[model samples]
Target: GAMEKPTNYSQETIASIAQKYQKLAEDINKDRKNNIADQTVIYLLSESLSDPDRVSNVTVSHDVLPNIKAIKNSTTAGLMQSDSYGGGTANMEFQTLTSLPFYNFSSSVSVLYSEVFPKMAKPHTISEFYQGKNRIAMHPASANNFNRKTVYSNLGFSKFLALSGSKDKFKNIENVGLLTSDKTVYNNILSLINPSESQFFSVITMQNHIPWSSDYPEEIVAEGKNFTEEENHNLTSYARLLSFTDKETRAFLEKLTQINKPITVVFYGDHLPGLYPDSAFNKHIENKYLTDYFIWSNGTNEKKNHPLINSSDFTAALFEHTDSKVSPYYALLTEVLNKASVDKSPDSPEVKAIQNDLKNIQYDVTIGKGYLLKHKTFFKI
Candidate 1:
């Protein structure tokens, strides 16, 4: 078979959103001025994505994930879907932070972590949206997995804190098998944030990356749902693991609130777990791409419904909430957000112009010399 050549899908997609490309650059500069002063954002990604609300029956455990009561403001909370699952964790990271879908660069479910992303001109990111913001990426596993060591450097993270290469190591919670627990990973967040610096830290957990072994201490059963005994065990075990995650998460948030400084937190499941059995669901469908997320803050009273949006739009939502800068790329993503819910073409020339604008800007970032290639003053900070 002949190897596939990358085609013009990238080119065509960019056409749908290009006319506003100049205005987008203007908006990006305008946004940079309006960034919330002295704020911090911590993004936490949990493994083996499961809907906290749908993960288990009420009897299984009341709070499978954190809620408004656990974290004060209840800023904006809703569901989000992962573009990919399984080992595509790195791919999800690229989308949420860059506000650019991997598919925009390629047709297949691909990984941009070590490939496309590390090579691109710093695509807009939540961290880059803020002024003088310090960004850090933390994961408890080996940094070598997916070549994250070199990749994080190019992604705008000031530091990459990994269990793989530290003179001092975090204490790992035992059992539940191979990977590190969410608790161990989160324990280092506070240390990474310097009081003088406004920081954006992304913490990745390994606790629930699973193969639910039978005969674990906890017994999991999804009542009134038709799943085989083995299926129930796997689902139940996943629930229990996340329940532990919820407990630790609650404590973590409580501590953050007590710090007397402005802080906001965003937590989400990466994608549905591979171990999840479709038979357990009412529809008996295979694992769906949808997962869940919540954005809560300690210093704000804002509460609103976040529409079900693609991962690219998710970054725009965060920028809107924080009143941060929207790069040309981000403004384009916001435009796409409005049209993302629909499929295919726009009915008229006016609408078609909008889609063309989106495609062009995306192309500039992912394929051509970045739109900002000629300008350094805008991002010089």
Candidate 2:
């Protein structure tokens, strides 16, 4: 069957819908007060990274990612539920940036970047919180993969640096396994930093992506119990790739720490690799959907205990950790995060209400008539 087209609401109805959300947002923002950080960077270390505690059978040594382990020990670290398991990297990236869950849309809407974002006028994103040329998005891969170039522009990113279009910026690049190394991505991120001004940088790395080449030396040997030879080989190769990410990330954070600016990094993996055996996934199906995440800052910020969270809750979580002021839009997101971390049940009254509100807001901005655009101040603090 062909997918049904979305209904078009009248101008008056759209205005009313927008007003309803606007009032809700304003009410939510009233009592909150905090200072926004000078600089914030979100690093999405794509694929094959997971919380070791969540997995069974596979054993990784202490020496594999010591720096990441040390950082996790000193900061707010936990499992983040990914909307994807193996692929669909763009969906996870979309949720993190927009604070909008994919669950809100119909199953027919597979890719939000392609199907939804291109139709939106000015969909709010984390980058919208920053001003002028301070907002940037970077990916060390082809921009055409997910229509990210257009999507980023529509989301108000002032600059987007990708491998295909921005080749000059990716000079002297290094490749660890198959794609651009995380070290190169970290260098590019560092190059964009301005010491005296505020900036928001969202980066998605390609180092740990698929086609896990076995070229890199296995610094970390990973072996699964009762596993086939091929599965064991895949696990070892993926683990080796993660070793490179761990090393590069440690160096990246060290560089950020040396800078005088107050920088906060929301680092997480997009999903676990598609390498595990059926037995491994069957042992703990939920664990397959979870990846490790941490909110770390070079400045003075207290560690928080957020055990599990959805990808959509990341920006709100970031604001909470940084003690940053929130716009009505973010306030709405914060409310959602407070009410439902990951287990969102429609049967519960509060959960149902908030979810409905979010769905309405999402629809208004994306597929519906651009009603929310009329309320210019809704997304601003």
Candidate 3:
């Protein structure tokens, strides 16, 4: 066969490397707990391909990958986030993405996926998507609405609750040294890990990202990793950066364990890193951080086997098998439906039975599950 080149190649190298990519990612994610998954899902058109000015913007990304790969490849980079690799529709929304760090760059890098994937998410905040980069024109005004951006600490700072338009409220905010290494920052990073005190039940996302970039929080470097913010966004940079996150996370877990080691914690990444060319990443889908989630508790590392679901069902599903059962908002729906079903115009014992079942489910778990469970399917006693 004559040498073939990509003719607008979307699934560019699937045949060559998907499995390997999946395996490599799986190996790194296994038996892990408490890690950070960060990176760029952009494309190779920018600094990755060798544009000095553009590359300079993502220099930190280039430096962080190797560091994360050491303990585990928690970070991801490259085209894993690309529509071509993720599936049919990659670039659907531009607004929701623009507020993100790198998406701040412009639509050029952000919406390239729209050219490749049709159903990807649409921008939730279009006007704001272009708010930062609107002044600059690297391409046509009506360019594919995907807004690519560079990582800036200011973007991270946005997650903070804005009090008022007054400067006094945010007087202490600083964009530099976000990913810069500093002990004081490391402890500060702890605040981001644990969810809001009000948020009791929660599922966390971690690992498989490009390291360095403007994301080098002062907390990360304090742990001792070598990723400078001057690097470009890439898998290598992610590998280095995430490793530090992994180590810090592990340390965090250990500290938790010192308080009580028997407790269990679930930790894993969503997908693999794009540290390599397309060929390297695609081969390892099963191993990808996003797709893989695991458990670390009660002196064990268990890779759970429930069918993959989004964050909505995660807590409920996990609790199903844990010492505690996962009860979701829908659990209430079960009771409501049962109640309405029995209130039909019949005063039969069957209606009473339905009501009994509903009462037991709630009361059993509340006043010690045994009361209802012992009578439930308990032997011929």
Candidate 4:
């Protein structure tokens, strides 16, 4: 019987191998006598490689130190709980109507007036609290959805990127089916369109917030569904308000283009209206368990054969479509959309590529967690 030998060599050969190993070990120990983390890897190819525009020495600063040298600092921080609750719609409307973003210190004043400093008969008092003329405007800042449209808009939520089905549908998120009003997100856009200018372009969406009133416009009410006064009044009020919102969105875009600014406008929904009771969330999804989707833009519509979930993937799909710079995590969303789908047939080449990217990122992020933690600042602002 022939057995595999762990080490096949003469005594002389083994002695030579042992000596080489000992020498290699000694060299490595000498080289690593000091922890190299304290030293920055500044490789200067030439005096001129440091400058991208010029052929200066490329100085790659690899600060591996814990403090003073490290660029990223991550710690737990408390976040606002009211991201999608209360009357955020009313809160956003008032913020824009008052031009708060355009204000200097007035933004502070506006926030206080909107949230705090409630006085009877005051100009900026809360609606439900005041029970006054504009009491209808009183709502919580949390009742909004921070969704993005195909285009960029001032009224739109804070968008890290812009995207569409043409680029890659899998790169988007499942917010189309989820519910979360993103209020005040638009208030913090980086002004990529008009960085120097103080103007903010606002856009109001009508997708998920399809107010029942608009669905049953006054014309519809007059024609059919005869009902009581209170019902009729409520229906008409909601319809008219939604109609106005739609018209206003169109007008806002028109104004942006009218100004001839490099501005972009986005007006999309968080999801279709929560038209059913909260208890029906399960049944609604069961119907979708076997369905694909249709995406509409302008007069154009596209159909998708795959499904996606809400995992912040659109953040990447956007950078693919817009002039905005996006972060890796957001870009990861794009990767998710353009690739990850419910369908896993090998015939779907696009899905395969996306799956690969997702797997690679997932693995790198997981196995290299300590490295990520150490160099976190390299990717941060």
Full-model lDDT for every candidate? 0.61, 0.74, 0.27, 0.26
For candidate 1, lDDT tens digit of each residue in 17-53? 3434446657565646445446788877877656535
Query: What TM-score does candidate 3 reach?
Result: 0.32
Per-residue lDDT for 248 in model 2? 83
Clash pairs, candidate 2, are: none
| 1-381: candidate 4 lDDT, tens digit per residue | 011122332334333333443443344334333221211111000000000101121111221112211101121101111112212332333322221211112223333233321221212111111112211110111222332221112222233222231221112222211211112122112223342332322333222343333333335231113344654443334333434333433343343343332432222222222222233233333321111111112221223222332212222222232323323333333344445433235467776554443443332332212223333321221
Candidate 1 whole-model C-alpha lDDT, 0 to 1: 0.61
Taking all chains together, each candidate's TM-score versus the true structure is 0.79, 0.88, 0.32, 0.34
Cα RMSD for predicted model 4: 24.9
Ranking, TM-score, top scorer first? 2, 1, 4, 3
RMSD of 1: 4.7
- Model 4 off-target regions past 4 Å? 1-217, 222-240, 277-311, 323-331, 341-371, 376-381
Which lDDT tens digits does candidate 3 get at residues 69-184?
33122211111122222311223122112212112123344443333122222211112212232111111111222322221112221222122321212122332222322222
What are the runs in model 2 whose C-alpha is more than 4 Å off? 1-33, 61-63, 156-158, 214-219, 344-346
Evaluate model 2: give its lDDT.
0.74
Error of 3 at 373 (Å): 29
Winning candidate number (lDDT): 2
C-alpha RMSD for every candidate: 4.7, 3.1, 20.2, 24.9
